[PDB]
Amino acid sequence: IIGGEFTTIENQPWFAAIYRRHRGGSVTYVCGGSLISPCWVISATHCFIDYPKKEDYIVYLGRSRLNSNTQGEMKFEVENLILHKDYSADTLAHHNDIALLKIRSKEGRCAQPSRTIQTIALPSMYNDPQFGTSCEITGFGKEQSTDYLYPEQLKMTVVKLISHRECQQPHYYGSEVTTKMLCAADPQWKTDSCQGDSGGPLVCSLQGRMTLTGIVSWGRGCALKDKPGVYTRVSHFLPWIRSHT
Ligand SMILES: N=C(N)NC(=O)c1nc(-c2cc3ccccc3o2)c(N2CCCCCC2)nc1N
């Protein structure tokens, strides 16, 4: 997250931290995700497509820091890793960039909700907020495009939904953005998602309820003028989600 503010998991209790085990033993951060039911985390396919073996991954819920344990956190193995069959990537865009992780503990349990661990509601079909609506994004991604390190503390920021009509402008993304994507950005371009925020939540208030509107997917750079964050449009994938859970 470029700009924004540091936060703790209580603020975004559905946020899932996804890591990969390396051949050799080291464990590195991969991507964010969102808990949509006790046994299911939703994320982005591009996070896993290189290393698509479920045994390689560790998922934490209730975790506020990248490389230290948070009191009350829970750790899971990935029982199922479900990537979208119609995934495709070009130079920039990732199409159908959505993935489901079924989580199970060593002792065979799913998430136990708590102050730090809660599910997020999915939107109703083809129902998104109007453009200009402020939404929140959360993650452990880079604080500056040029940084080598990820932040140790979770962050969040606010971005505003941009219309399909504005996003498709040539100086924005042209035809790279589809109707199954959403664009969001800061009016000054000063705050944004970045590398390591992929798979995390874009959350909007929809009919007086915090709702998973988008999943962090791609962008050209981070916090660059005329280059919004692009998000998988969750309200266009409900049959896929319902079917695969
Ligand atoms: N909100 C956005 N505008 N953009 C995004 O969400 C986004 N950006 C980048 C991004 C591009 C970039 C270029 C130079 C330096 C750092 C960079 O990070 C990104 N990476 C991070 C680069 C490593 C491989 C993974 C792709 N993923 C995103 N999902």
Per residue, the 3-state secondary structure of 213-225, as one string, reads EEEEEECCCCCEC
Yes or no: say if 83 and 49 are a contact pair by the CB < 8 Å rule: yes
What length does the chain have? Answer: 245
43 lines ligand 1 (CB under 6 A): no
- Residue closest by Cα to atom 27 of ligand 1: 195
- Residue closest by Cα to atom 29 of ligand 1: 218
The b/e string for 19-57 (b: 16+ C-beta within 10 A; e otherwise) is bbeeeeeeeebbbbbbbbeebbbbbbbbbbeeeeeeebb
Determine whether 97 is an active site residue.
yes
Q: What share of the chain is helix, strand, coil (3-state, %, to 5)?
A: 10, 40, 50
Catalytic residue among 198, 217, 235, 236: 198
Distances 2 to 32, 114, 153, 159 between C-alpha atoms, Å: 15, 29, 13, 11
222 lines ligand 1 (CB under 6 A): yes
Distances 71 to 65, 76, 115, 219, 225 between C-alpha atoms, Å: 10, 16, 11, 34, 39
Yes or no: say if 16 and 116 are a contact pair by the CB < 8 Å rule: no
192 lines ligand 1 (CB under 6 A): yes
Yes or no: say if 240 and 98 are a contact pair by the CB < 8 Å rule: yes
Give domain limits for the chain.
1-12+120-235, 13-119+236-245
232 lines ligand 1 (CB under 6 A): no
CA distance 245 to 243: 6
CA–centroid distance, 202 to ligand 1, in Å, is: 16
Query: CB within 8 A of 130, min separation 6: which ones?
Result: 161
Query: CB within 8 A of 88, min separation 6: which ones?
Result: 94, 95, 96
- DSSP SS3 for 203: strand
CA torsion sign, 13 to 161 to 82 to 153?
A: negative
- Which residues on adjacent β-strands are paired with residue 97? none
CA–centroid distance, 219 to ligand 1, in Å, is: 6
Yes or no: say if 160 and 192 are a contact pair by the CB < 8 Å rule: no
CA–centroid distance, 223 to ligand 1, in Å, is: 10
The domain at 13-119+236-245 falls in which architecture?
A: Beta Barrel (2.40)
Alpha-helical (H) ranges within 92-237 are: 164-167
Determine whether 198 is an active site residue.
yes
Determine whether 46 is an active site residue.
yes
CA–centroid distance, 221 to ligand 1, in Å, is: 5
> Which atom of ligand 1 is closest in space to residue 228's alpha carbon?
3
Catalytic residue among 97, 186, 192, 197: 97
Task: Give the CA-trace dihedral at 239, 240, 243, 245, to 10 degrees.
Answer: -120
Q: What is the resolution of this structure in A?
A: 1.6
Query: CB within 8 A of 12, min separation 6: which ones?
Result: 136, 138, 154, 156, 201, 203
49 lines ligand 1 (CB under 6 A): no
CA–centroid distance, 114 to ligand 1, in Å, is: 32
How was this model experimentally determined? Answer: X-ray
